[PDB]
Design a protein around this ligand. Structure first.
Ligand SMILES: *[C@@H]1O[C@H](CO)[C@@H](O[C@@H]2O[C@H](CO)[C@@H](O[C@H]3O[C@H](CO[C@H]4O[C@H](CO[C@H]5O[C@H](CO)[C@@H](O)[C@H](O)[C@@H]5O)[C@@H](O)[C@H](O)[C@@H]4O)[C@@H](O)[C@H](O)[C@@H]3O)[C@H](O)[C@H]2NC(C)=O)[C@H](O)[C@H]1NC(C)=O
Ligand SMILES: *[C@@H]1O[C@H](CO)[C@@H](O[C@@H]2O[C@H](CO)[C@@H](O[C@H]3O[C@H](CO[C@H]4O[C@H](CO[C@H]5O[C@H](CO)[C@@H](O)[C@H](O)[C@@H]5O)[C@@H](O)[C@H](O)[C@@H]4O)[C@@H](O)[C@H](O)[C@@H]3O)[C@H](O)[C@H]2NC(C)=O)[C@H](O)[C@H]1NC(C)=O
Ligand code: HEM
Ligand code: HEM
Ligand SMILES: *[C@@H]1O[C@H](CO)[C@@H](O[C@@H]2O[C@H](CO)[C@@H](O)[C@H](O)[C@H]2NC(C)=O)[C@H](O)[C@H]1NC(C)=O
Ligand SMILES: *[C@@H]1O[C@H](CO)[C@@H](O[C@@H]2O[C@H](CO)[C@@H](O)[C@H](O)[C@H]2NC(C)=O)[C@H](O)[C@H]1NC(C)=O
Ligand SMILES: *[C@@H]1O[C@H](CO)[C@@H](O[C@@H]2O[C@H](CO)[C@@H](O)[C@H](O)[C@H]2NC(C)=O)[C@H](O)[C@H]1NC(C)=O
Ligand SMILES: *[C@@H]1O[C@H](CO)[C@@H](O[C@@H]2O[C@H](CO)[C@@H](O)[C@H](O)[C@H]2NC(C)=O)[C@H](O)[C@H]1NC(C)=O
Ligand SMILES: CCCCCCCCO[C@@H]1O[C@H](CO)[C@@H](O)[C@H](O)[C@H]1O
Ligand SMILES: CCCCCCCCO[C@@H]1O[C@H](CO)[C@@H](O)[C@H](O)[C@H]1O
Ligand SMILES: CCCCCCCCO[C@@H]1O[C@H](CO)[C@@H](O)[C@H](O)[C@H]1O
Ligand SMILES: Cc1onc(-c2ccc(Cl)o2)c1-c1ccccc1
Ligand SMILES: Cc1onc(-c2ccc(Cl)o2)c1-c1ccccc1
Lengths: 553, 553
């Protein structure tokens, strides 16, 4: 008997449950709808859907009318809108978490065992004909044919929106503090148990690396000093597990907290500037707190860096991504009037969503010369050859690649985008239109409606067979971008809920932690409120390069 | 220079922070008060303190006027009051957690590392003359002299309130799912990382014991069958670490999930009745869900037992403790309108508070005969010699001891109460009057005001020297009880916030989990809503004994 839950009968977050041998029931409890499929609207939900503008229309409002938004930003509405953004987005995500790679249902284990990635939509039941439910081919398209013919960069397409490499590296570094899929345990499992902005990519997955990384005097961290400049220490002085090539000297590695940050120079760059920041904050704390032991200087400085990070990510990072005239604002007090769970756990769909490799260029330009991937990847010397200044300046000037549209992944990195597709299939994610539905959107009715063109659309229909079978990652990357934006709507309406729920679910944003005492008094609390990217690189530097998430357009 | 934070300058939850070499500042952020010590009231907080009745007065209201409360219970106010009780109590406890044995300040480590017990009030700074701050002797009273002369049961004082042993055993069994102090890591550390009603005392601290305890067919658990009755299996069939005496046969142990439950027969008795419940729930689920695999039957049955547990604990357990005419009610929807963090982490003061050993009698009466402690402790055969029925009947008939007043711990168990005092001193808890203050009450001004008499009061002043130095556990147990109640006010106003915050902070109470789908449809959801103690023992039994948290008065 065909498993009824593969027709996806339950609409609007209704929970499909199996009864008897061939029956099903939708749990519509607080879905706001009624009926056997959760399709009969309650009076208020009806009133809201009949008044609810198009997502692309609200994107239009936020991206037009500089005069109106000058007024909004200069008044209190700038706050109310922000509070609305935070609230309406974060509500789409379950809190506490619901599902994981092993359980398509609420369970105490999925709640307890934090080494799972969580899950927004359940799995595709294995007892169903199609691998995507019931629509599509009985075996769906090849992974590297999709990746090669639809994601492979033929010519470089720069970000229409100004995004630079100083941004993309920030996205990688920042992101790998909570995306640590362990090949040892398999797909849908994490080594980063913080599940948020804990700076586990600076301080480590465990207390071991942390102890082997900090200097234990004045709360600082261990550090080399090369050419008169401050850098991370080597495995000789701070011996911790870190992936490197098998031949480089030991005085040439560095110790950071994220095992992979030795590979790319941008990652180790951020490790450097953050570490300098931490030790500087330690200095500022000990200036006012001569009596504190080491570990309080450490923990307080860590909280200050967590605050600075969420601050910069919201007001500059997501600002650059959004293109909104509305100036986003990091004020945790905006949520003190709301029902909000200060708690995050990361979903499968959110790192698969976040694979933004098209941001990487054809080459890496530093100054007048040019480094290919083979020269840039794994390069041990470039980070210290050029001052941190010079690398920030060169990265913040070179454009980054557009993420949407398709055919904009360099051929070197392209293999990641293949594995993700295959990984999607092992994680058994639902069809693109089903996530599309769960994040408040309407499913596409044709491939040509998806891509906004006719060639890739025709071929996509030739491969998948039905739009309802398109896959999560592919369709998310082949969607048409908004006009002059860095990617289309699905990445907006899906990624934004995860990003904001993860940035403000941090307990430092709670009413309990969000006090000046938590950050060693007023100097550190204002140090979190006034943090900027320019302050972060420049305050830890001998000179100011061009530092920005956008090129000098 | 004397550490200023030992004067406890900060009032009303203000955070004492040290500046310079000899300065301090109180963080009064949302304490509702102003000023350098947090003593200047804001207008609304002033209006509330001038209208706030005495805690003992509200205790008077809740414990008098059966007619008025017949009306209140029969109407909707029965709900509003409950929502008030839940809200006002739970607000006293920090969420997310704040402190631990190692950090007297908010830190990412205290947030992350769940093997710590949390902490409501900070430690006593070590750089201070008195071990309790600044008031009292430079070395404070002996532990076993206090315990022997002030806590030792001279004659049995029965609970004025009807409490029986079927209750006290329930309190022990129920409590040891979240109190698992590990002697290996030291004081202020736990093995029960659930920190709540996860039934880790039925299913285990880890997935290992869990797998070695369930039968993996139809989601049930392993089980022996002795005399035609269902019991837990032995270490031969379910081999898991469990403390026992070093000589008893292997076919005489049993496997439960709490390592210590083999020792007392009441503990293993609850282990039995719960296990029978679980397997019965598995049967009920598979009756409607022929298609579910083993592990979904397991996880769903576990959630159902968690719901049954919180239900019984709130509406029967805490009811028996309270003596309130107001019928308490477990409805998680009462908090769906509130700002409430569905998240709990256990504090030091809450297991030290919960050491209720005076509930244990001089002897253990079963039927016409009587077993001394030496006969009852560690007894392997008594649980199976008498039917579970007969043990429930004998325990629910024998009175339990009053907890307050003092001089009511049996000499056998008395040593625990000594260690707790010493353990208090290693955990460096603050003075009794300081917790007294933080839970909304006024510090006692004299020992005779504490005990309500003159003899123990005079000697307590002779030992401690000042009431502001009296200790948490001792003063909590020497306090005068309310008239005809099981203990005084401090146990009420302190323990109630921890108990309710822990009972409703469970994620099954969240809006996300609290659905009929989470509990395998409607039969299990109503099985949680209609759970009672009588249903729990009787539905898993051949006959109904007298089962109640109170004697047949
Ligand atoms: C979060 O979840 C993950 C995944 O659930 C956890 O990591 C996994 O943990 C699993 C269990 O700890 C582990 O799965 C095991 O799978 C089998 C289990 O079979 C056992 O039992 C049978 C029979 O019973 C045996 O018991 C006795 C006891 O001593 C044995 O000697 C005797 O031989 C008897 O038969 C046997 O088939 C088997 O021999 C096992 O004992 C094991 O064989 C596996 O090796 C494995 O241990 C799984 O591998 C873990 N990893 C993954 C990726 O799933 C993770 O721990 C958890 N995190 C937290 C914090 O809870
Ligand atoms: C929750 O918190 C608890 C407590 O914080 C965690 O359990 C504790 O973990 C502690 C650290 O993991 C542990 O303390 C350790 O302390 C001594 C001394 O530590 C040394 O630290 C550095 C390390 O120097 C080492 O360098 C080389 C490099 O590889 C080592 O081999 C070599 O052995 C050398 O020591 C020294 O500079 C310093 O001087 C100290 O000597 C360790 O030696 C102990 O073995 C211990 O591991 C503590 O014992 C743990 N237990 C308790 C009760 O505190 C718990 O893990 C945590 N939970 C989570 C989930 O994070
Ligand atoms: C130099 C450019 C980059 C290279 C070479 C690169 C390479 C890789 C590779 C090889 C993997 C496979 C991971 C694994 O198997 O565990 C991977 C994973 C990943 N990359 Fe990249 N990447 C690059 C840039 C980026 C950027 C710019 C982002 C996003 C902002 C990104 C996000 C990720 C994520 C999210 C993962 C998977 C996370 C996990 O489970 O750990 N990468 N990357
Ligand atoms: C025969 C009756 C009882 C005996 C022998 C008994 C014995 C003990 C002993 C020996 C400890 C030692 C603690 C340790 O070192 O880790 C202990 C702990 C404890 N007992 Fe009792 N107890 C009894 C009844 C009760 C009851 C009725 C309660 C109800 C509150 C209770 C609550 C506790 C608590 C909370 C702990 C500490 C928890 C921990 O850290 O694991 N006990 N008990
Ligand atoms: C709930 O969803 C199911 C699945 O989409 C709907 O069931 C199908 O209805 C059509 C039209 O009558 C039938 O031909 C199919 O055989 C049904 N499939 C199954 C699996 O039952 C159902 O109609 C929806 N509920 C309502 C009220 O429309
Ligand atoms: C790593 O980067 C360094 C640059 O910092 C490379 O060495 C430079 O190479 C360019 C041309 O490739 C020269 O023009 C520079 O003069 C070199 N500078 C130094 C200090 O060596 C190095 O070759 C790179 N590593 C790899 C493997 O290509
Ligand atoms: C805040 O708390 C401190 C400590 O209780 C108070 O300080 C004491 O005040 C008395 C009277 O002025 C002095 O004799 C003591 O020497 C003070 N002790 C210390 C450590 O300063 C302080 O007065 C309180 N603040 C206010 C406004 O009363
Ligand atoms: C454990 O309890 C059993 C009771 O079931 C004890 O054995 C009983 O003891 C009483 C009097 O002590 C007798 O009247 C019963 O006839 C005995 N029954 C059985 C089956 O032995 C046993 O002695 C207890 N253990 C200890 C150490 O005292
Ligand atoms: C001019 C009005 C600005 C309001 C800012 C709200 C930001 C969130 O607008 C988004 O719209 C989407 C449309 O599909 C919804 O799916 C999301 O739930 C909602 O967060
Ligand atoms: C007339 C019945 C009133 C029902 C409401 C009682 C619940 C509120 O309980 C209150 O909790 C506070 C914080 O823990 C304490 O300070 C108060 O003493 C206590 O009354
Ligand atoms: C609105 C109805 C009010 C009825 C008057 C109730 C008087 C309660 O009197 C109470 O007596 C207690 C001792 O029993 C004391 O502990 C309390 O301080 C006191 O308020
Ligand atoms: C792009 C972009 O542009 N605006 C964005 C946004 C944030 C909040 C709301 Cl509401 O919208 C995002 C985004 C940010 C993070 C992840 C994924 C998308
Ligand atoms: C005893 C007793 O009596 N009433 C109680 C009560 C419940 C809610 C409010 Cl408010 O009061 C309690 C209690 C409840 C939990 C823990 C410790 C004590």
């Amino acid at each position: 008997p065909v498993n009824p839950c593969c027709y996806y009968p339950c609409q609007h977050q209704g929970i499909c449950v199996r009864f008897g041998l061939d029956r099903y029931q939708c749990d519509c409890t607080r879905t706001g709808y009624s009926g056997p499929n959760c399709t009969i609207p309650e009076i208020w939900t009806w009133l809201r859907t009949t008044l609810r503008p198009s997502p692309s229309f609200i994107h239009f409002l936020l991206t037009h009318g500089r005069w109106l938004w000058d007024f909004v930003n200069a008044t209190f509405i700038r706050d109310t809108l922000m509070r609305l953004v935070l609230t309406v987005r974060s509500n789409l995500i379950p809190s506490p978490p619901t599902y994981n790679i092993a359980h398509d249902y609420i369970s105490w284990e999925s709640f307890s065992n934090v080494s799972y990635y969580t899950r927004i939509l359940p799995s595709v039941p294995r007892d169903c004909p199609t691998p995507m439910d019931t629509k599509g081919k009985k075996q769906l398209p090849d992974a590297e044919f999709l990746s090669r013919r639809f994601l492979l960069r033929r010519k470089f397409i720069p970000d229409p929106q100004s995004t630079n490499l100083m941004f993309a590296f920030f996205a990688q570094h920042f992101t790998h503090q909570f995306f640590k899929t362990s090949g040892k345990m398999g797909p849908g499992f994490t080594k980063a148990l913080g599940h948020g902005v804990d700076l586990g990519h600076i301080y480590g997955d465990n207390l071991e690396r942390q102890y082997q990384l900090r200097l234990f005097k004045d709360g600082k961290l261990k550090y080399q000093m090369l050419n008169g400049e401050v850098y991370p220490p080597s495995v000789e002085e701070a011996p911790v597990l870190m992936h490197y090539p098998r031949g480089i000297p030991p005085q040439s590695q560095m110790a950071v907290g994220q095992e992979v940050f030795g590979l790319l120079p941008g990652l180790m760059l951020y490790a450097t500037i953050w570490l300098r920041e931490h030790n500087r904050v330690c200095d500022l704390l000990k200036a006012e707190h001569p009596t504190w032991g080491d570990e309080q200087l450490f923990q307080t400085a860590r909280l200050i860096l967590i605050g600075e990070t969420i601050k910069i990510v919201i007001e500059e990072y997501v600002q650059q991504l959004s293109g909104y005239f509305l100036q986003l604002k990091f004020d945790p007090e905006l949520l003190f009037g709301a029902q909000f769970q200060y708690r995050n756990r990361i979903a499968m769909e959110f790192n698969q969503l976040y694979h933004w490799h098209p941001l990487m260029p054809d080459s890496f330009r530093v100054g007048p010369q040019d480094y290919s991937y083979e020269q840039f990847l794994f390069n041990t010397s470039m980070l210290v050859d050029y001052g941190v200044e010079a690398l920030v300046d060169a990265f913040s000037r070179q454009p980054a690649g557009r993420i949407g549209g398709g055919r904009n992944i360099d051929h070197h990195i392209l293999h990641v985008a293949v594995d993700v597709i295959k990984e999607s299939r092992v994680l058994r994610l639902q069809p693109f239109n089903e996530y599309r539905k769960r994040f408040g959107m309407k499913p596409y009715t044709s491939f040509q409606e998806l891509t906004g063109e006719k060639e890739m659309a025709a071929e996509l229909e030739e491969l998948y067979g039905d739009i309802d079978a398109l896959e999560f990652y592919p369709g998310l990357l082949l969607e048409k971008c908004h006009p002059n934006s860095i990617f289309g709507e699905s990445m907006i309406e899906m990624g934004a809920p995860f990003s904001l729920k993860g940035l403000l679910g941090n307990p430092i944003c709670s009413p309990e932690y969000w006090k000046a005492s938590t950050f060693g008094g007023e100097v550190g609390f204002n140090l979190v409120k006034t943090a900027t990217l320019k302050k972060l690189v420049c305050l830890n530097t001998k000179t100011c390069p061009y530092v920005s998430f956008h090129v000098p357009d």
